[PDB]
Design a protein around this nucleic acid. Structure first.
Ligand SMILES: [Mg+2]
Ligand SMILES: [Mg+2]
Ligand SMILES: [Mg+2]
Ligand SMILES: [Mg+2]
Ligand SMILES: [Mg+2]
Ligand SMILES: [Mg+2]
Ligand SMILES: [Mg+2]
Ligand SMILES: [Mg+2]
Ligand SMILES: [Mg+2]
Ligand SMILES: [Mg+2]
Ligand SMILES: [Mg+2]
Ligand SMILES: [Mg+2]
Ligand SMILES: [Mg+2]
Ligand SMILES: [Mg+2]
Ligand SMILES: [Mg+2]
Ligand SMILES: [Mg+2]
Ligand SMILES: [Mg+2]
Ligand SMILES: [Mg+2]
Ligand SMILES: [Mg+2]
Ligand SMILES: [Mg+2]
Ligand SMILES: [Mg+2]
Ligand SMILES: [Mg+2]
Ligand SMILES: [Mg+2]
Ligand SMILES: [Mg+2]
Lengths: 56, 53, 52, 125, 147, 187, 128
RNA sequence: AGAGGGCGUGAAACCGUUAAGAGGUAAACGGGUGGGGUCCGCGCAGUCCGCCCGGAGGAUUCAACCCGGCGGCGGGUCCGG
RNA sequence: CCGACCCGUCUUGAAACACGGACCAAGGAGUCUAACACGUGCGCGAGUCGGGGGCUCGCACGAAAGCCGCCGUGGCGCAAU
RNA sequence: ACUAAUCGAACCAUCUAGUAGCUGGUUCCCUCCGAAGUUUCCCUCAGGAUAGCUGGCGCUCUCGCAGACCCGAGCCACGCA
RNA sequence: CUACGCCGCGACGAGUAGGAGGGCCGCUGCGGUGAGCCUUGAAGCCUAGGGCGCGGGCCCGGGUGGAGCCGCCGCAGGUGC
């Protein structure tokens, strides 16, 4: 608790965070989410194939 | 110094050393059809970093 | 004076090195890379008659 | 073999010059005069080289014949081209490309011939 | 080659790899195997148990030649003769068995490690072990002694 | 500042042979290309074995090779060892073996060839089976070295059977105190 | 006038001054050649503010423009005419320095041959 | 003899003189500029070079054929080796 | 203009009223032998090794290199208890 | 007290480069990793051995290496904290 | 495409004692090599001269000097204040 500030984000906060600063951990590398294929190749097996699916 | 079939007749115990690589022609080995059939296609496209707009 | 100036090498390794040197002396690229000016020698394993 | 001889002479050669963070090779048949497996003019079964002619006009294209690999006295064929620049470059292009005689040295030989001819033409004022 | 050693890399470092606090002094702890029972006792007990004390009977004027008795095992027994010998014995129609003289080959005792090929053989040795004799008999051979 | 620890950043492994053997380097080039451009894991294993040191490439005896190749289902397969095949004079019959090796002892080579066998270098193996199909990859006994009889728990500790370093073996050399109950203790 | 390089990028030097040895100003016995301070109390080694800066790898030049002369060429040292024909195909990126010990009558020939081969010499009028 | 009988070369410390600059927080130092100065850049009308178009000139000869020479590749082994 | 105490050293702690240091040049300190241990490279591999001796126009190099094999005696390894 | 400016054992040379757990010093650059002053034993307490903390060398495995540009086609690793 | 090479992506960067790697950092000598340099001027030294490298250092211009010297691949140290 003394080292963090936390709270309950809303839909707008989630959207801004994923769209402006969203980076994926693809092959242990910090890759910017500039395409939906990067999400699909790592999370498609779970039904997540786009930025919108990730945000949802 | 002997052949690889004969031992040396003037050294009483000596024979020529053996090759650990019979065919040293890397170009012909790699261009041989039996090597080429087993290979996956080359990935010759360079994927430079994408500026995160 | 007892610095151990001398080294002993295995006889098999010494023969190996002799074989390697002889084999290299028959390749024109290596003899040229030793700078020996063989551009008009008729045949690199150059053998002459016993009259010499 | 070419690869074996390259492993022998890639760092131990009397043609090797290592200076000023650069490396160079001064063997006779080295286009671009660089220390490299592709451009080495001694280790390959077929080589091509371009030199200035004996008199300062034209080029001499030397190619390595297939048969006498161990016979350096007859291993190289030298032909002198003393045409105009475009005809000379076309002749070298045809020797390398039509024969399929080391097609990876085509532009190196063409550029070296262009450099030699440009050096041979009289200076300006 | 002195050019490949640490001393060439320790130029400019004042302590030469021996520390500023404890330094490099002449002989801290003593010389040689000093204090093996007092202040190097843990090392001596840990890595060289049995170092201190006497065990057994001493014997003045030991002569190694008297007790010289090299040994050979049954698995290496057939290597003492030529390959021609073994193949001729194997393909021989009669029951004639070759003689292996381990004293001639330089061995005095035949030991029993390994197994023998199923073919008879006469073995001449100074000494035999019980299992070696049993195996030689088991393959139809014989053990004969020499002095 | 980032809260990470850097003492394990650099993985300690052979990326190339420490040897300067040009033939070994040439066939390292060959298997580097094969391991990169194939999906075969056999090529990867063989490449990383080629990098290895001599103590990590122990010799393989003819008897052990024969025993491993004698197992069911390994008929007409190529025995591959990244190292030296050694003659074993304790074996009497040698079967017909197709073997690839880095080195073969002269006597072992004579025995294999007299048995009707075939011996391949690693370039010939690359031509014969580029992906390593139909191969039995064998290794010599890695811990069959004298140093491993000294490695382990210290000799002067209970339940340790590790060989001590002694200049001589005899009744006077490290047998009294700490070795029997009659002299202090045993453990 | 002069021969121009193939490309002339903007050379950026992270540091232009030299790294002088600590306390080289206070003693003649201390040359300005850089020596790493290893004293226990050394404030330059400890990197206190306002002190003499220590060289480190972060000052390294861009690899594209490393070793370029201000003219954009990169320098190669030659001793006779034969060593000058290695630059025949490196013409547009490498220039030649005649070595300091080459005599005047020989460096004249080197200069003239380089003028023929369109090779740039950084000291073409050096013994005359 | 800017080699003159302890005389090849002739460094630093230290000193004399000349020249330039500066000077009440002991000098000295790091970073950033500014001023001056000595030099450097053949700086001082600013590059080149591939194709094409136009103008006005030269010249073997351009292609294609013929003869000869030499190479590269292919050939049931055409024939040997 | 801003920053900036003198280095070396022992020390929990040095700018210290702690010690050494006026300045400059040259010299100046983990070496060699033997024995171990482990790691790495090379050759041969159940073996390996001629190091002592001998044979080879005795000798510019050459005090080297080459060879011995019924010179492998021997050392170490192949068996321990 | 005095015994050649030397005396609670002169001077000279040698053994002798006597020994020192104590003081002082220990010579180029960059890069990577990076401590301990604690446990046990020691005529041990200004020191060692021992474990701990460190570095180096590795080795045995695990995830997948993907589509030649593109293009995933209940279930998603040995194990660890 | 000097495969001991070249290229791409991501994360990271304090450091004494200490350890390791790289050094186209430097000194002296040996085997090779540079058809290397040099009385049309070697080494050394001096320099408000031009530069290169993160750095150790190095190259070039000018002067002095007057006879020897250096690069590269290995080798060996009485090798860096
Ligand atoms: Mg340090
Ligand atoms: Mg202490
Ligand atoms: Mg760190
Ligand atoms: Mg700089
Ligand atoms: Mg100074
Ligand atoms: Mg401190
Ligand atoms: Mg004088
Ligand atoms: Mg003055
Ligand atoms: Mg002190
Ligand atoms: Mg105190
Ligand atoms: Mg201090
Ligand atoms: Mg005070
Ligand atoms: Mg005082
Ligand atoms: Mg004191
Ligand atoms: Mg004082
Ligand atoms: Mg003093
Ligand atoms: Mg000095
Ligand atoms: Mg001899
Ligand atoms: Mg014997
Ligand atoms: Mg006690
Ligand atoms: Mg103290
Ligand atoms: Mg950071
Ligand atoms: Mg660091
Ligand atoms: Mg010294």
């Amino acid at each position: 608790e003394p080292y963090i500030a936390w709270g309950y984000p809303n839909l707008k906060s989630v959207n801004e965070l994923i769209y402006k600063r969203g980076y994926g951990k693809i092959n242990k590398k910090r890759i910017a989410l500039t395409d939906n294929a990067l999400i699909a190749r790592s999370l498609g097996k779970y039904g997540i194939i786009c930025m919108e699916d990730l945000i949802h | 110094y002997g052949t690889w079939r004969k031992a040396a007749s003037l050294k009483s115990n000596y024979n020529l050393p053996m090759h650990k690589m019979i065919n040293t022609d890397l170009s012909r080995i790699l261009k041989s059809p039996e090597i080429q059939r087993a290979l996956r296609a080359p990935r010759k496209k360079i994927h430079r970093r994408v500026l995160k707009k | 004076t007892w610095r151990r100036w001398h080294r002993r090498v295995n006889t098999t390794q010494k023969r190996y090195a002799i074989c390697s040197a002889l084999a290299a002396s028959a390749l024109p690229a290596l003899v040229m890379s030793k700078g020996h000016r063989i551009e008009e020698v008729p045949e690199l394993p150059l053998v002459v008659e016993d009259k010499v | 073999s070419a690869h074996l001889q390259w492993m022998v002479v890639r760092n131990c050669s009397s043609f090797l010059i290592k200076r000023n963070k650069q490396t160079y090779s001064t063997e006779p048949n080295n286009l671009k005069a660089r220390n490299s497996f592709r451009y080495n003019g001694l280790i390959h079964r077929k080589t091509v080289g371009v030199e200035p002619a004996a008199d300062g006009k034209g080029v001499v294209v030397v190619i390595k014949r297939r048969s006498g690999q161990r016979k350096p006295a007859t291993s190289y064929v030298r032909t002198t081209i003393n045409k105009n620049a475009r005809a000379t470059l076309s002749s070298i292009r045809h020797m390398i490309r039509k024969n399929k005689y080391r097609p990876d040295l085509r532009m190196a030989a063409i550029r070296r011939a262009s450099a030699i001819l440009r050096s041979q033409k009289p200076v300006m004022v | 080659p002195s050019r490949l050693r640490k001393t060439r890399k320790l130029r400019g470092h004042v302590s030469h790899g021996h520390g500023r606090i404890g330094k490099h002094r002449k002989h801290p702890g003593g010389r040689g195997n000093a204090g093996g029972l007092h202040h190097h006792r843990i090392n001596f007990d840990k890595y060289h148990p049995g170092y201190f004390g006497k065990v057994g009977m001493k014997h003045y004027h030991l002569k190694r030649n008297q007790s010289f008795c090299p040994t050979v095992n049954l698995d290496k027994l057939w290597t003492l003769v030529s390959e021609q010998t073994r193949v001729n014995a194997a393909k021989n129609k009669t029951g004639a068995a070759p003689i292996i003289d381990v004293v001639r080959s330089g061995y005095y005792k035949v030991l029993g490690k390994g197994k023998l090929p199923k073919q008879p053989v006469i073995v001449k040795a100074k000494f035999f072990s019980r299992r070696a004799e049993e195996k030689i008999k088991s393959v139809g051979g014989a053990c004969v002694l020499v002095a | 500042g980032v809260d990470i620890r850097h003492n394990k950043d650099r993985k300690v492994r052979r990326k190339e042979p420490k040897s300067q053997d040009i033939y070994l380097r040439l066939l390292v080039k060959l298997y580097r290309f094969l391991a990169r451009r194939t999906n075969s894991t056999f090529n990867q294993v063989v490449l990383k074995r080629l990098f290895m040191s001599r103590t990590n490439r122990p010799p393989l005896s003819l008897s052990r090779m024969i025993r491993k190749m004698k197992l069911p289902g390994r008929e007409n397969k190529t025995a591959v060892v990244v190292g030296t095949i050694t003659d074993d004079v304790r074996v009497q019959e040698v079967p017909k073996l197709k073997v690839c090796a880095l080195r073969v002892t002269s006597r072992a080579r004579s025995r294999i060839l007299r048995a009707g066998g075939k011996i391949l270098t690693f370039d010939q193996l690359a031509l014969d089976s580029p992906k390593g199909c139909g191969t039995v990859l064998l290794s010599g006994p890695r811990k069959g070295r004298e140093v491993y009889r000294h490695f382990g728990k210290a000799p002067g500790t209970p339940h340790s059977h590790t060989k001590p370093y002694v200049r001589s073996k005899g009744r006077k050399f490290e047998r009294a105190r700490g070795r029997r109950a009659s002299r202090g203790y045993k453990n | 006038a002069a021969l121009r390089p193939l490309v002339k990028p903007k050379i950026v030097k992270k540091r232009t001054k030299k790294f002088i040895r600590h306390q080289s100003d206070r003693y003649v016995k201390i040359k300005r050649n850089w020596r790493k301070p290893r004293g226990i109390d050394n404030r330059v080694r400890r990197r206190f503010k306002g002190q003499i800066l220590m060289p480190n790898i972060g000052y390294g030049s861009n690899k594209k423009t490393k070793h370029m002369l201000p003219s954009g060429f990169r320098k190669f040292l030659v001793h006779n005419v034969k060593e000058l024909e290695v630059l025949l195909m490196c013409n547009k990126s490498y220039c030649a320095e005649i070595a300091h010990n080459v005599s005047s009558k020989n460096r004249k020939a080197i200069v003239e041959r380089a003028a023929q081969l369109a090779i740039r010499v950084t000291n073409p009028n050096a013994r005359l």
